[PDB]
């Protein structure tokens, strides 16, 4: 039913290497060229990729910033209330960033904020202008 294992033989293939005299030598040069083609294409992205490596010298260690550790509180100092309103205008609904900006309020205290002070801060409006960007 099937060849020896490892040997490759195929109706499509066999016809293509018999179709004429040097139809053998032909097909084995479109593959020797296909090979060199793809082989220097490697040294040339291997070359490009080397440049981009040089530009990342040092990574971002100098531009990094220390982590902030601060115990998450419950009351809303009027300071923190105002950081909130300005945060809702630059971050839309990304509560994660909004909690990160404040740094002391639960992503859910943030959600709670949205409904409690909803009236006295007009976030719908504020939010509607966040959408204007």
């Amino acid at each position: 039913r099937k060849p020896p294992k490892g040997m490759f033989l195929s109706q499509e293939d066999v016809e293509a290497v018999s179709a004429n005299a040097t139809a053998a030598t032909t097909v084995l040069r479109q593959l020797d060229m296909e090979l060199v083609s793809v082989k220097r294409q490697i040294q040339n992205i291997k070359q490009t990729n080397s440049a981009l490596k040089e530009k990342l010298d040092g990574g971002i260690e100098p531009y990094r910033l220390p982590e902030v550790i601060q115990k998450c509180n419950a009351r809303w100092t009027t300071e923190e209330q105002l950081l909130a309103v300005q945060a809702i205008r630059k971050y839309g609904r990304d509560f994660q960033a909004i909690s990160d900006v404040i740094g002391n309020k639960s992503v859910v205290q943030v959600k709670n904020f949205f409904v409690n002070y909803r009236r006295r801060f007009n976030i719908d409006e504020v939010l509607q202008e966040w959408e204007a960007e």
Partner: protein, 666 residues
């Protein structure tokens, strides 16, 4: 196999079925009840066993019936019909046996046999055995034909056949018992030395051989499973197919490198897009720092909008620092993936030149077996006789294979030095016209009832004809002769004054330099008592070494021996012999092969006899007068000595049945 059933196997017969030949002789039984067939089958097997168990004495009908048991020794016409069939077709009482009932003095009918080669002798011994007047006409000054046996002093070396292919069902097994032939086995350990004379290591040696046997099966798959058996009208040869399989294996090695490196490229491109995000992000990060610093440079206490900018900037700076860290996470993997593929590549080449050169020796051996270059061998049929292989070690004949034919020639009328030039066969008999090979003017005429022709196929194929048939052989016969292949191999005999090779190694190779010279002195045999080394020239090289003096050939032989064993251990050989089969005019070749465009069917055509036309128009169809025997006629066991022998026995029964009358079919 053992018992009565071993006799059926040893006689090339199914122990539990009636063969087609037997049905024709015994239609009553094979069309009859299953019980009768089993009785017959036993009586057949049991008689074979008797003859086999002691083949130096005739097995008479009496001796047989004696030693059967009832119920089998009850029906005595069934035992008589079985014994007579057996004896007629050379299944019992063939070869060299002591006659219990001396052949009657008055002969019946007359038969000329052309050639005292083994097949000729076989039929001739059997025809005389049947009480017929048998004369053999031999062109040479010796019997044996292709079984030659160089003899000078203590040296003995056959230049023709030299191996007995295993006694398991081999008529030669019987003849060996019948005639003492020193039989030695052949250890199959053969090491192959390279062109430089350095022994090939087991690694390559075992590797290539496995790949060779792997390429062979590949052709058999091209032949039977893809029906790749015809190309631009010409039928496909084995050589052709082996090339289309080595090409397709070299193609595959490339397709395999392409789609591997093409994983590298794709992988490297993935990296290219990743480093472009990472360098454009270290830019947003560098710029963002300039802003958070600057925004932190506004010392407190500040308005709540100024404080928002510092915290917000420090956050998008923490956001973009999460991103850039997730991307040098992804960068790590890709960097390691590349390092994998780069140092884990696939096979670079299908076959090294040194490896393939070794392979070309394995193709030399295959051109040895079939005595012809592989381009010629029919792809579909070259191995059609492979089902009928005997079982057992292959052997050699230490005293020379010449003794068998000579023994058979004992008691036969052999006219040596007698070159048949015209065979003339007519509705009323035949006359054979021969000359004397020494002074050719001196002409001979032989009249006879039937001519059995064991002319070598190469003789039959000579253009212009070396033997004229009158009337001409019919087209169905001469087309068969053209189509069939008759090839060539030669041997060189090297006689030294001392063993300087490995004495526990019967045969050792030499690897050629080219594909074109793969056959040229590619194999050597220590086979004999004396210090004799045998060199084989096969393939395309056989036909070309015949144009080169013996010294030039012995020259090359020494050279290759020399490098293989040192230049101070290989002395000049005392006596040297070279054959030239395709040059010999009585062989024009070594033996036959299934050539492309031929089939096994041609081997049967060769064996059909020729029935001549009626002399007086209106007369009834005559008797067949011209018969054929020999290596190229036995389709199931060709190119061999046993095949020849079987062909000879075959025609003797066929000829006898015709002129003596088969009274065993009633």
């Amino acid at each position: 196999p053992s018992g009565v059933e071993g006799a059926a196997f040893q006689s090339r017969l199914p122990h539990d079925r009636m063969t087609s030949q037997e049905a024709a002789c015994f239609p009553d039984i094979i069309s009859g009840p299953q019980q009768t067939q089993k009785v017959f089958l036993f009586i057949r097997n049991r008689t074979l066993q008797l003859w086999l168990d002691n083949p130096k004495i005739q097995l008479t009908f009496e001796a047989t019936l004696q030693q059967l048991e009832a119920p089998y020794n009850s029906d005595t016409v069934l035992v008589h019909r079985v014994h007579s069939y057996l004896e007629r077709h050379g299944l019992i009482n063939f070869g060299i046996y002591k006659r219990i009932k001396p052949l009657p003095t008055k002969k019946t009918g007359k038969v000329i046999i052309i050639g005292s080669g083994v097949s000729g002798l076989a039929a001739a011994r059997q025809l005389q055995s049947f009480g017929m007047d048998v004369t053999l006409l031999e062109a040479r000054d010796r019997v044996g034909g292709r079984v030659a046996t160089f003899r000078k002093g203590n040296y003995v070396a056959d230049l023709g056949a030299m191996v007995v292919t295993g006694l398991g069902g081999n008529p030669m097994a019987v003849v060996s018992k019948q005639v003492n032939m020193e039989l030695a086995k052949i250890k199959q350990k053969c090491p192959l030395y390279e062109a430089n004379g350095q022994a090939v290591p087991k690694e390559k040696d075992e590797m290539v051989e496995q790949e060779f046997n792997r390429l062979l099966e590949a052709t058999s798959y091209l032949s039977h499973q893809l029906d790749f058996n015809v190309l631009n009208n010409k039928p496909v040869s084995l050589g052709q197919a082996l090339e289309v399989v080595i090409q397709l294996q070299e193609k595959h090695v490339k397709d395999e490198q392409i789609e591997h490196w093409k994983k590298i490229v794709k992988t490297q491109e993935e990296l290219k897009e990743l480093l472009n995000k990472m360098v454009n992000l270290k830019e947003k990060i560098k710029e963002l720092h300039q802003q958070y610093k600057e925004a932190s440079e506004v010392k407190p206490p500040r308005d709540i909008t100024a404080e928002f900018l510092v915290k917000s900037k420090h956050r998008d700076l923490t956001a973009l620092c999460k991103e850039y860290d997730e991307l040098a996470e992804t960068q790590g993997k890709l960097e390691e993936k590349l390092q994998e593929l780069e140092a884990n590549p696939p096979s670079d080449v299908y076959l090294s030149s040194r490896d393939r050169q070794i392979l070309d020796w394995h193709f030399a051996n295959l051109e040895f077996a079939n005595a012809t270059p592989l381009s010629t061998l029919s792809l579909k049929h070259w191995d059609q006789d492979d089902d009928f292989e005997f079982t057992g070690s292959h052997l050699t004949v230490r005293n020379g294979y010449s003794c068998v034919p000579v023994a058979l020639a004992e008691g036969l009328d052999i006219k040596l030095n007698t070159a048949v030039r015209q065979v003339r066969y007519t509705a009323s008999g035949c006359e054979v016209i021969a000359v004397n090979t020494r002074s050719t003017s001196q002409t001979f005429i032989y009249k006879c009832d039937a001519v059995l022709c064991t002319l070598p196929l190469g003789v039959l194929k000579q253009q212009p004809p070396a033997v004229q048939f009158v009337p001409p052989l019919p087209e169905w016969k001469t087309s068969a002769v053209q189509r069939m292949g008759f090839g060539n191999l030669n041997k060189v005999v090297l006689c030294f004054d001392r063993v300087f090779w490995d004495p526990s190694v019967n045969l050792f190779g030499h690897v050629g330099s080219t594909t074109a010279s793969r056959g040229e002195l590619f194999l050597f045999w220590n086979l004999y008592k004396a210090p004799i080394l045998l060199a084989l020239v096969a393939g395309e090289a056989a036909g070309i070494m015949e144009n080169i003096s013996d010294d030039v050939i012995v020259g090359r032989c020494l050279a290759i021996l020399k490098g293989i064993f040192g230049s101070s251990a290989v002395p000049q050989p005392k006596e040297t012999v070279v054959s030239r089969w395709r040059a010999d005019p009585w062989a024009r070749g070594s033996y036959s092969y299934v050539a492309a465009g031929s089939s096994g069917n041609d081997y049967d055509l060769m064996a059909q006899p020729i029935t001549p036309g009626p002399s007086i128009p209106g007369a009834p169809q005559p008797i067949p007068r011209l018969f054929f025997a020999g290596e190229h006629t036995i389709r199931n066991y060709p190119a061999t000595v046993h095949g020849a022998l079987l062909s000879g026995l075959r025609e003797a029964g066929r000829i006898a049945d015709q002129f003596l009358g088969a009274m065993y079919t009633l």
